[PDB]
Design a protein around this ligand. Structure first.
Ligand SMILES: *[C@@H]1O[C@H](CO)[C@@H](O)[C@H](O)[C@H]1NC(C)=O
Lengths: 40, 22
């Protein structure tokens, strides 16, 4: 069964980050990615 | 902030609650 549906807004994915005293994160590897920007 | 024949005021897509959450 397929039809029109109505849903509330997807505000986005929920990300859990934990602020901690004296704790740090540093990236180990890295990734290189190219993105398209279009200006008329 | 103090707010304010065929003329209808369309509500914004982004509600105040979702803007505050952003
Ligand atoms: C970094 O990522 C690449 C893939 O993008 C992977 O091939 C490479 O092994 C990674 N480097 C390390 C040290 O894991």
């Amino acid at each position: 069964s397929q039809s029109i549906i109505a849903y509330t807004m997807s505000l986005g994915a929920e990300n859990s980050v934990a602020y901690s005293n004296n704790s740090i994160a540093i990236p180990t590897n890295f990734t290189i990615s190219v993105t398209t920007e279009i200006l008329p | 902030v103090t707010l304010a024949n065929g003329l209808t005021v369309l509500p914004p897509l982004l509600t105040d609650e979702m803007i505050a959450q952003y």
